[PDB]
Every structure is written in structure tokens, then in C-alpha cells.
């Protein structure tokens, strides 16, 4: 077999959207509040994350099918998946040598050290860093990566989804494009799809873990005041 | 006549509090989101202002008498007067030569040019800049300045004040300490008190003007998202 027009189209659509929402130069980082190497790295990281949410939203809008859902479902999907999509897209800048998120320069190289001073314990960072590596290893293709993100985001099983049938349809089409791609255009990728979907499962664990920690943070004004409106809104639990 | 113990005390209390809440080095500015010389100067200035609100709050807590009011009245007083107290304390860094707010370096020198790109029209900036100069000219003493701020903040005529009698008492004591000071320890200051109180009146006009403009801004998400939780909260109209 081989990918069809509609399928290649979907890939081009996604990959191009990813490009249009992922600045490989990391030039925008200078605009965030300076990283300070007691939650010293919270302001910068809060800005980095808020920035990421913005890109995630723009990426979504460009997923064929996402645009036609009810704002309620788009929001439902966003709020629920945002954090994971961010952990996913963040791997594209994760290094194995120094085991960190290198983003342009040394002042934007986040080591396990820095990442701590952001208000998050290792109960989160540990599984996250493991996810980052297990994923890095898969040495995916831009299309398998861009697809995995789209799939993840179009998961109907998120608290809030109304039309968990149309959202179910879209994702299945996406799941295929991937499954197919890994088949036709991906040599030595016989056990990949499995591992990839498996990653979506790891993300859920990380999602849950972050939610608890974040909830703990948001209840402390001296900290919540350090966040951004966008972050407070998306990560906040307002039905 | 001459100032009394209780009066000098109040001054020492205020002046020391001002010192403990006004960093003459402006070292904290490097922590704000970088100034970018379409509301380009909003992120930085929003951080500068949020930072200022924090100091204003700490200054307040140190005003003898403020600490014993009901949180509701303290909040009422803060939300209502904050903006003015900020415009007041900001003069302490206003220059006549370059007609700007110089704060440490050239990257923190806010010219009438910059100040525009913060989302505010000249209908505000104009009166503000005029206030800044008319005030600068008074060449006040640290004690007349620190006092004017305390007085301003302890104005009972603010929408929300419950006990507008105790707050009335405190301010009158403050109004005197000043009136007295300008008398005893201030040569050539015969028409000062009058002019000073007159300034409190100009502030009201600026307060009103800013409120309208800010209200306009806060209704635009693409802009409100640029603000800080603290600013949204204090400048926001939630009863």
C-alpha cells in the first residue's frame, strides 16, 4: 500500500502548521522575563510556557478539522491537552549529551538543575525527563512528530468534550496517516506506532502529575501572581 | 511652634518606610520583561507597574494606622489610590533636562515616545507629564514627598471605604505633620501646602483618565493577557 492524496495532504498541512508555530531560532526567548539561575526560574519558565500555549493554540487552529468544532470542544481539547502538547513539542529542543532543553544559547539551556527552581518537584521532573529521552530515542520524523502532536490534541477522552464522536473521527483519520506513514515511508519502523501510542499514555501520567503540582502552586498568591493570565486561564480549573 | 514627638515620629516612620520600599538603584528592572523601543512597551511597563504596586502595598503596611484598618478598607484604599501613589512615587525619577523617567540606565529611560507604546493616548500622558513637572518644580523634601504619598493613600473619599471616619482621622493627623513641617522646617514654603494639596486634586483627574483608558485595554484579551495578575486584580473592577 501507500499514502493517498488526502493523507499526504493532511501531513503537509500539519508539518507546515508546525513550522508556522515553532521558531527554530528561539529568538522570542529574549522577550521573556530573564532566567535567574525559592522558585527563581518561575517567571522565565512561566513566560516560556505561556508562549508555548500560544503556539499550541495556533498549531491547533491549523489542524484540518479542528477549526470546525464547537469553541467549547476546542477549548475542552486545549485545556486538557495543552500541557502534554507542550511537553511533546519541547522534546524538539532536548539534548542527550547535556540532558537539557537547549534553546538557542547557554542562557536558554535548561538543565535538570534549573527546571527544579520552577516550583516543580522531581516526582514530576523525573518521569518527564524519562519521557523526554524515551521519546528522543524514537528518532521520529517531522511528520511522525507533527502527527503525534495532532493526534494527542485530538484525543476525545478529555474532561469537557461534547462531541466525542467527531473528535473521535478526526483522530482516527490522523492515527491512520501516521500508522500508514510509519509503514510506507519509515524503514525499520515496525514496532514504532506501538511505542508512539505508548508515549501518549506516558503523557497522561505526566499530565496528571503536573496538574496536582500546579494546583498546589496556583493556591499560593505569592506564586500565582508570578504566572501569566493565559496560563492561569488554561491551567485553571474553571468550568 | 515646632513639630512634636508624635509628629517627628510619624515622619521618621514614613520616610524610613519609603526607603524600605524604593530602590534608588533600580536594580530590579532587569528582572522585568525587556523594554522594546502596537503597544511594544506594554510588557515591560506592565511589569514595572506591577512591581510598583507591590512596593506601594509594602509602603502602606508601614504607615502608622494603616495596619489597623479592616482589610476591606485597606484594599479599598489601595485599589482606589494605587495608581496615583505610583504616579507620585514615579516623579522621584523624573528628569527635567530630557523630560523622562530615567531609571538607572538608558535602557530604562522612558521618554514621552516610549510611554506612548504602552497602550495609553496623550489625553493621559499630557496631563501626567504636566503633573510630573509641576510637581518636580515644588522641589519637595523627602518628608514632604513621603508625607504627600501617605496622605494621598489615606484619603477617605474613595469608592469602597467603610470606616471613612478613622481613615479621616489618620489623614488629618498626616495633613498636619505636613502643614507643620512646611512651616517650621521649610524656608520659603509659605504657599507650598496649598500647592501640594492642589496636586492631590490633579491626581484625581489623572486617576479618572487612566481608569477609562485602562478599562478600554482590559476588555481586549490580546492586551489584558500582557498584564500581570496583580495589575488585573488591583486595576480590575471586582467589588
Amino acid at each position: 500500500h501507500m499514502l493517498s492524496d488526502e493523507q499526504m495532504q493532511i501531513i503537509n498541512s500539519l508539518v507546515e502548521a508546525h513550522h508556522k508555530t515553532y521558531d527554530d531560532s528561539y529568538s522570542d526567548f529574549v522577550r521573556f522575563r530573564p532566567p535567574v539561575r525559592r522558585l527563581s526560574m518561575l517567571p522565565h519558565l512561566a513566560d516560556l510556557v505561556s508562549y508555548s500555549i500560544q503556539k499550541v493554540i495556533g498549531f491547533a487552529k491549523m489542524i484540518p478539522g479542528f477549526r470546525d468544532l464547537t469553541a467549547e470542544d476546542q477549548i475542552a481539547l486545549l485545556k486538557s491537552s495543552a500541557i502534554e502538547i507542550i511537553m511533546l513539542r519541547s522534546n524538539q529542543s532536548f539534548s542527550l549529551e547535556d540532558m537539557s532543553w537547549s534553546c538557542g544559547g547557554p542562557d536558554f539551556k535548561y538543565c535538570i538543575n534549573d527546571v527544579t527552581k520552577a516550583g516543580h518537584t522531581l516526582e514530576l521532573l523525573e518521569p518527564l525527563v524519562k519521557f523526554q529521552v524515551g521519546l528522543k530515542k524514537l528518532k521520529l520524523h517531522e511528520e511522525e512528530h507533527v502527527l503525534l502532536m495532532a493526534i494527542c490534541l485530538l484525543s476525545p477522552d478529555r474532561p469537557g468534550v461534547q462531541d466525542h464522536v467527531r473528535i473521535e473521527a478526526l483522530q482516527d483519520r490522523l492515527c491512520d496517516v501516521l500508522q500508514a506513514y510509519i509503514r510506507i515511508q519509515h524503514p525499520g519502523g515496525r514496532l514504532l506506532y506501538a511505542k508512539m501510542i505508548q508515549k501518549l499514555a506516558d503523557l497522561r501520567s505526566l499530565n496528571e502529575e503536573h496538574s496536582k503540582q500546579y494546583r498546589s502552586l496556583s493556591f499560593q498568591p505569592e506564586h500565582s501572581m508570578q504566572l501569566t493570565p493565559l496560563v492561569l486561564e488554561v491551567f485553571g480549573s474553571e468550568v | 511652634h515646632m513639630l512634636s514627638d508624635e509628629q517627628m515620629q510619624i515622619i521618621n516612620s514614613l520616610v524610613e518606610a519609603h526607603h524600605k520600599t524604593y530602590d534608588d538603584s533600580y536594580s530590579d528592572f532587569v528582572r522585568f520583561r525587556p523594554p522594546v523601543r502596537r503597544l511594544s512597551m506594554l510588557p515591560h511597563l506592565a511589569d514595572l507597574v506591577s512591581y510598583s504596586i507591590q512596593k506601594v502595598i509594602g509602603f502602606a503596611k508601614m504607615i502608622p494606622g494603616f495596619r489597623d484598618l479592616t482589610a476591606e478598607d485597606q484594599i479599598a484604599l489601595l485599589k482606589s489610590s494605587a495608581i496615583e501613589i505610583i504616579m507620585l512615587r514615579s516623579n522621584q525619577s523624573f528628569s527635567l533636562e530630557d523630560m523622562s523617567w530615567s531609571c538607572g540606565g538608558p535602557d530604562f529611560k522612558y521618554c514621552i515616545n516610549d510611554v506612548t507604546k504602552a497602550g495609553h493616548t496623550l489625553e493621559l500622558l499630557e496631563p501626567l507629564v504636566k503633573f510630573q513637572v509641576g510637581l518636580k518644580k515644588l522641589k519637595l523634601h523627602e518628608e514632604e514627598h513621603v508625607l504627600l504619598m501617605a496622605i494621598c493613600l489615606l484619603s477617605p473619599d474613595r469608592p469602597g471605604v467603610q470606616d471613612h471616619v478613622r481613615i479621616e482621622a489618620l489623614q488629618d493627623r498626616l495633613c498636619d505633620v505636613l502643614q507643620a513641617y512646611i512651616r517650621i522646617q521649610h524656608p520659603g514654603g509659605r504657599l507650598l501646602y496649598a500647592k501640594m494639596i492642589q496636586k492631590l486634586a490633579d491626581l484625581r483627574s489623572l486617576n479618572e483618565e487612566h481608569s477609562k483608558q485602562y478599562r478600554s485595554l482590559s476588555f481586549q484579551p490580546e492586551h489584558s493577557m500582557q498584564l500581570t495578575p496583580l495589575v488585573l486584580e488591583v486595576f480590575g473592577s471586582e467589588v
Partner: peptide, 11 residues
């Protein structure tokens, strides 16, 4: 709610 998300999500 979700003032921001809405704006960002609209064309």
C-alpha cells in the same frame, strides 16, 4: 469564561 482562549481561537 476563557476570555483569552476565545480571542486566540478566533480567526
Amino acid at each position: 469564561r476563557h476570555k483569552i482562549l476565545h480571542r486566540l481561537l478566533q480567526e
